Scaffold this active site. Structure first.
Site, PDB file in Angstrom:
ATOM      1  N   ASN A  95       0.794  -1.220  -0.052  1.00 20.02           N
ATOM      2  CA  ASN A  95       0.018   0.173  -0.058  1.00 20.02           C
ATOM      3  C   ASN A  95       0.769   1.533  -0.209  1.00 20.02           C
ATOM      4  O   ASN A  95       0.472   2.205   0.785  1.00 20.02           O
ATOM      5  CB  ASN A  95      -0.983   0.091   1.226  1.00 20.02           C
ATOM      6  CG  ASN A  95      -0.418   0.073   2.564  1.00 20.02           C
ATOM      7  OD1 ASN A  95       0.726  -0.180   2.869  1.00 20.02           O
ATOM      8  ND2 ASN A  95      -1.285   0.573   3.625  1.00 20.02           N
ATOM      9  N   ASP A 305       2.550  -5.525  11.914  1.00 17.99           N
ATOM     10  CA  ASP A 305       1.557  -4.500  11.197  1.00 17.99           C
ATOM     11  C   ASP A 305       2.331  -2.949  11.848  1.00 17.99           C
ATOM     12  O   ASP A 305       1.343  -2.130  11.924  1.00 17.99           O
ATOM     13  CB  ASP A 305       0.333  -4.648  11.249  1.00 17.99           C
ATOM     14  CG  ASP A 305      -0.781  -3.910  10.457  1.00 17.99           C
ATOM     15  OD1 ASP A 305       0.012  -3.206   9.559  1.00 17.99           O
ATOM     16  OD2 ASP A 305      -1.849  -3.756  10.393  1.00 17.99           O
TER      17      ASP A 305
END
Ligand SMILES: O=C1C[C@@H](C(=O)O)NC(=O)N1
Ligand SMILES: O=C1C[C@@H](C(=O)O)NC(=O)N1
Ligand SMILES: [Zn+2]
Ligand SMILES: [Zn+2]
EC number: 3.5.2.3
Lengths: 422, 422
Positions: A95, A305
């Site tokens: 992303n 993450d």
């Protein structure tokens, strides 16, 4: 650098059922011998006395923000975080801007990571072109260029044939799909659908958004034969569903963000937007279930993450970017479970080393003879504070900001080269 | 009709754990007494000697095609089929034209069914306006008018919040959602994705289309507290998923179309378009799993999904309307399982009576004192053929057309009135 010896440390290599006080000899970036009191003429020595010696940690879920959002973090700053946290290998998410859906972006990252030279950065590709969710990306070209998995993180795939087709084409290539599980009809708000959303009127994200996609992915994995890796698991039902598919022999793996082990939705009341994350922090019962899933082997690995955002992106919860940094805090966070006697030290290391290695199919997370000398050396008891003095991220977004942590990396070694020391 | 006696039959009323040779006295459409050799002055008598006497069967999945497709079937022809098949109560699906998404259509059906006067027809409403899948229908007005459940049959609901909202508003009203489970991205072809689709190149419908929605519905049912009823279950994985949610105390029920117990995808090669149905006939392993789910109590009831279509709608498979008629064949089809010793006679009756009654929350499927005198009387061994001589449907679309069936209704009684006899 022909020869290095890591002396007097407590070695743990779960991949080999190997533990005890051993020295490690490294020759040409590789593991040469592991034995009691090794001594060689003209060797580099690092003394690991009183410390834990294990394979370099691998984090299969990191946002480097590079290209396109380098004010948040970049390959250099993220790699320093990684190695300062004990990671010799990280998998970066796609992303970015532009997203990793072509070989130019893959190559840019690979080359920049080589220039930086601290940890191995393994790119992933998107599942869909532009990550827009409509058309499968060119898996064949992306894998050939070096991608190790495909994900649309942090966007879910909403069309079931798209996900099925991703799984089919990926398994054909021998690589997994990492899926960001949150149905966008049920997860378009900002925090968990629980007590805090009810109390404050913040828009919410339903736990079923995650559960429904995990269930979908297990079924798809089952019927396609593909391997799906579920990112950042956050609920009790989720773990139940995963175990149900694992029980059937389905290739489904999962990970937990250590923040979800430490915090609940209530943290939104104490840390504001630095507790805004997707999937959200949920309830006590979920937090405890996660810990139980770690204990019972349902959760296959820890993965941060690591998702840096600037302070101005962490003001009013409603407008805040979701995510928490975590590369530097993963180990003390995990060690909290060790201290409470929930997991053994071997188990904690498994979750950072061999388990994530096996998920992405790389021969790492090991101290096997002949393998790369990726070694982490740490003090389970050393106290420190994540603050301006100590933070290597360009960003500060974590509820652990300014709090006392116990457990700290003293040395990180990558291909026989010391790339980090306390 | 003040008084009726059903004499000398073998009574089975599983709701009361009641069985043996008993007579039944009926007074004013209601069950008055059940006892050995009852005799009353000036009573109607039907002799059930050598026959099985049980509550009227309830089929919670029937297409009456009325309004709008009455050349296929109508309330009259479907009601005659129902009663000829042993059914005193049927639930009609809302995919009529116009669909049942307003109280005018509900009332039309209720009034027409009263005029016909053979079985109780209980309408359902759509989940969405026009069954277009976008906006929840007016559950409140539809329930008040007499709808007993909401379904978009034979269309799936594709948006997860729509389904969640349906479940929320329905449970608030105390009624279930009946869901037609087939994800439309994975199920837009004509037959199962298996051997026959592969061999012939007919477009296919993936078993995961069903599985993914069943899994979604179990999760939604769990988190909303609503009751979801899964229509026409057709795969092994599906049953596994249902059982997984039943094990957790979730209000999830399911049914099986007896055709799926009898036929596999191979039937498309023998019967052509009369084997085209949604969900499709699948594999041997699925067929056997279904039978096993009936045996183990995972499948809660039999329900026909009686779905009549004309012969010109059953020509080339690619252009054929999906569906199989089944009201007249449900009982001999079920009795096949009894004959193979797979289920007991009591169990077969449970699946036609008390189980479907409990799913839709009606006090029927019973011979409890004071309850309506809905009684079915049948010969488990009587042979007949479904053909022009014997078919009460306006349509003929079933692979059992012209084949020998064993098991047949001799009498059907509704509110103490004989509405059918052999
Ligand atoms: O899914 C995601 C993506 C991530 C990001 O900022 O990239 N931050 C999150 O909290 N969740
Ligand atoms: O879902 C459905 C609906 C039905 C019909 O014809 O109404 N026929 C079928 O085969 N499947
Ligand atoms: Zn991520
Ligand atoms: Zn139907």
């Amino acid at each position: 650098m022909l020869k290095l010896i890591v002396k007097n440390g407590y070695v743990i290599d779960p991949s080999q059922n190997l533990e005890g006080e051993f020295d490690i000899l490294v020759e040409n970036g590789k593991i040469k011998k592991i034995d009691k009191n090794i001594l060689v003429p003209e060797a580099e020595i690092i003394d690991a006395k009183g410390l834990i010696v294990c394979p370099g940690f691998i984090d299969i879920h990191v946002h480097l923000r590079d290209p396109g959002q380098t004010y948040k973090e970049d390959i250099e700053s993220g790699s320093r975080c990684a190695v300062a946290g004990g990671f010799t290998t990280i998998v970066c998410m796609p992303n970015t801007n532009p997203p990793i859906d072509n070989t130019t972006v893959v190559n840019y990252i690979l080359q920049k990571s080589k220039s930086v030279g601290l940890c191995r950065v393994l790119p992933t590709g998107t599942i869909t072109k532009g990550r827009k969710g409509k058309e499968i990306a060119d898996f064949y070209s992306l894998k050939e260029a070096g991608c190790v998995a495909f994900t649309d993180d942090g966007s879910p795939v909403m069309d079931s044939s798209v996900m099925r087709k991703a799984l089919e084409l990926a398994s054909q290539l021998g690589v997994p799909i990492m899926d960001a599980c949150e149905d966008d009809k049920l997860a378009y708000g900002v925090i968990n659908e629980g007590e805090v959303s009810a109390l404050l009127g913040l828009s919410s994200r339903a736990p079923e958004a995650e559960e429904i996609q995990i269930a979908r992915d297990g079924i798809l994995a089952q019927r396609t034969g593909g391997h799906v890796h579920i990112q950042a698991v956050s609920t009790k039902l989720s773990l139940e569903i995963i175990e149900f598919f694992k029980e059937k022999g389905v290739k489904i793996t999962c990970e937990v963000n250590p923040n979800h082990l430490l915090f609940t939705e209530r943290e939104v009341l104490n840390s504001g937007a630095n507790a805004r994350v997707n999937p959200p922090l949920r309830k006590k019962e979920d937090r405890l279930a996660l810990i139980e899933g770690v204990k019972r082997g349902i959760i296959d690995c820890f993965a941060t993450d690591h998702a840096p955002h600037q302070t101005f992106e962490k003001e009013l919860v409603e407008f805040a970017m979701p995510g928490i940094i975590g590369l530097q805090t993963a180990l003390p966070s995990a060690l909290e479970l060790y201290r409470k006697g929930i997991i053994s030290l071997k188990k904690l290391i498994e979750m950072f080393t061999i388990n994530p290695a096996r998920i992405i199919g790389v021969d790492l997370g090991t101290l096997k003879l002949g393998s790369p000398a990726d070694i982490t050396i740490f003090d389970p008891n050393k106290e420190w504070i994540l603050n301006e003095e100590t933070n290597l991220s360009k960003s500060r977004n974590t509820p652990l900001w300014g709090k006392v942590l116990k457990g700290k990396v003293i040395y990180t070694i990558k291909d026989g080269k010391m790339v980090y020391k306390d």
